[PDB]
Point group: C3
Chain length 289, copies 3
């Protein structure tokens, strides 16, 4: 009576002695009841009770809720802003970016453009299209030396004919071709009687020195009839005595089938049986393709 | 003799009618006969390993000095994905390249006058034509020498006039004209004229009579209006009083061109009295003015 | 029971229970406390722990955290604003380039490699072809922007002032002449004026000494024929020469041609045409032409 004879859990009595039942998590510390916190799991008895512990840089409490400090992601939100601000996502032709290989390259026309051995871009050097007499003269565009000067020779027959007089003669003659003119340089020669008027004929069908050809003696006026290069020449006329020199008019009259005709006329005449012709050069513009 | 023992108690203990009971707030509860800590729900707390513990995802968190902390591996992915981009990526383009740091679009600046993007999208040079100057010209597809420069033919139908020591007279003639490279050639026919002086000038009047497309200017010499002694040659002219002509060797040359009139000098070589002259054919040549 | 004192009620307790002066009390460490008259858990401050929903619970931001198998775990929606921004760059981005394109992995700059002898960057920042002057060999040349024919090849005038010499069978003598020289295309023209000389023979040589007398920009070598020093019969023509001994001249026709050029002396042949005795010659003006050598 007035004593204590029974007790409600977690108190219990045995033989006048009271003890207390504890689950895990409650324990004895010195003489006192305490919360038991095995290990280090962020819980601790500190500042007068039970508290939770968290790295101060990574976490914080807001209205007593565990929260993440925003300064956690700063290094990430920066390293990505440092890109979104400027980077290449697409490329326009001639550029092409393979979104998968992360590889960019360029579309060049191989015909016009190429890459240096030094990895540079440069224009394909193309040989220019040239028509004779324009040609590659030692590296550059120039003038074919062959157009400017070509030397040959003619060994052939010169035929005179004028109102019923006829004779031939063999001559040896230099030929020069220079730009658009040809020059036949006839030596002096002897022949027979000439008429007041007549034709002198150079037969190029035979006798030109290779690689020259009969067609190479065709005038630019082809086979028209002309009075081209009209000049005055002097011819010794005689009957075996001292020749008398007669002035005569000579010109290029017409070219036909590789035979060039020169007219020889004017000056009045004289009975004679032999003629002493001088050297005469004959020039005319030459045919081309 | 007696001992009644415990007769009173302090909180959280109390005693009523011989029975002692213990008061509990929230968070403290009876498990069986044992006092226990109450953990409602699943908030991360738990009774384990002998007592109260906190439970955390062991890949995302760890305990350092008994403080909750993020594992660095939690970020490992992020740091390598970003690093794999950092080490090599395009941030800026320099001309002719251009980066639009907004639309993330890269292209290229070109000069369309010389360069173009072809049909298939490649980069071709603009196939053009070389700047040529007459007499150089496009000869059927290539850079060549213009045919009109190499040979052009025309005609002159007009008056040659003679003048010398009071003698004056005119003759109508027609002549082929050949222009070849930088020279002109006028091909005069033999003709009949009148008395001549020892010295005198024969004049060709190109002011009219040239046949299209030739014009008077086309007969100007490269030495223009200068006085010269060009192409000096020897010509034989027949002098007569109506009888058999005597042929005098005279000296002829191109003297001067003036306002579309070409003047030739005819001089030297002796003289007789006469009233009629017989001129041979003469071809007159000189270098041509060019623009 | 012969036990002096018979205990009734509770006469002893164990820790954390204690009796003092017949009262019983319970010792409490930090973390356990009284609220009203009840045993209670003390949670100083705000560390995320709280008594609520009937007992002890932990509190976390419901956006950033969640519980799984009763474990604190990171929500996914907290990393999603990052895995997207990144996934959005991983798709389309340049990691490397091929020439003429070149990327500096350090400066993160993309440039273009160009050969500057063929390509330029105009004043607009455009890639354009450098207008290159092509290889031209005289007489082909730059004629006001175009590929044309050099005016100096088409025509040049100058002058020779020097000595003409006659030689033939003991006969010999010289004269000073002033002559024009015209160079047209591949020909040279020497326009000799009329001069007076002395005794000529049936055949002989007229020599023009070009070693001096040429007016700049001309040089002795510019008078070398295309056929160099060959002996030729070039441009043979007929000239009339007045011969006399004081009184009335007789005009003799002779044959002249260019025969040979050698060491700056052009030699003309003069022969043919019959002969008379005489001490004076009147030469006409005579023009002389031949193809000119070239480089
Ligand atoms: C988070 C933490 O520190 N957890 C420890 C825990 C708690 O402090 C108590 O459980 C709360 O009542 O104690 C543990 O050790 C119990 C023994 O501690 C011994 O000394 C310890 C002391 O408890 C620690 O706080 C201190 O940091 O280190 C000391 C080392 O001497 C006492 O001497 C002994 O009587 C016991 O009470 C436990 O298991 O409960 C260990 C936890 O790490
Ligand atoms: C994290 C967790 O399990 N939380 C539960 C919670 C805790 O286990 C206790 O608070 C620890 O003391 O208990 C809850 O259930 C209350 C009843 O539990 C009964 O014992 C259970 C116990 O819940 C389990 O944890 C244990 O493993 O099994 C025991 C046997 O059933 C008690 O016997 C009863 O008196 C109550 O305490 C609670 O709501 O508090 C359930 C929580 O989810
Ligand atoms: C997280 C939280 O709410 N903690 C509070 C607790 C609880 O109210 C009781 O301890 C539960 O019984 O304790 C205080 O009274 C205290 O010691 O100052 C206030 C403190 O802020």
């Amino acid at each position: 009576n007035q004593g204590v004879t029974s007790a409600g859990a977690p108190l219990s009595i045995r033989n006048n002695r009271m003890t207390m039942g504890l689950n895990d998590g409650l324990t004895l510390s010195g003489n006192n009841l305490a919360i038991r916190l095995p290990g280090n799991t962020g819980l601790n008895i500190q500042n007068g009770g039970l508290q939770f512990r968290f790295n101060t840089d990574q976490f914080q409490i807001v209205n007593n809720n565990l929260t993440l400090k925003t300064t956690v992601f700063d290094s990430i939100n920066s390293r990505i802003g440092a890109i979104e601000q400027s980077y290449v996502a697409s490329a326009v032709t001639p550029l092409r970016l393979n979104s998968s290989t992360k590889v960019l390259d360029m579309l060049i026309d191989s015909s016009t453009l190429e890459i240096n051995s030094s990895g540079q871009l440069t224009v394909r050097s193309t040989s220019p299209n040239l028509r004779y007499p324009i040609a590659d003269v030692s590296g550059g565009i120039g003038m074919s030396p062959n157009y400017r000067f070509r030397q040959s020779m003619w060994i052939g027959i010169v035929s005179y004919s004028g109102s019923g007089l006829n004779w031939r003669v063999q001559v040896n003659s230099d030929i020069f071709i220079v730009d658009d003119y040809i020059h036949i340089c006839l030596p002096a020669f002897d022949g027979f009687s000439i008429a007041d008027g007549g034709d002198l004929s150079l037969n190029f069908v035979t006798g030109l020195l290779p690689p020259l050809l009969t067609g190479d003696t065709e005038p630019a006026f082809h086979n028209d009839v002309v009075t081209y290069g009209a000049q005055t020449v002097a011819i010794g006329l005689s009957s075996g005595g001292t020749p008398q020199y007669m002035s005569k008019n000579l010109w290029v009259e017409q070219w036909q089938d590789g035979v060039l005709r020169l007219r020889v006329e004017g000056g009045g005449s004289i009975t004679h049986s032999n003629s002493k012709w001088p050297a005469m050069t004959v020039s005319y513009p030459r045919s081309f393709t």
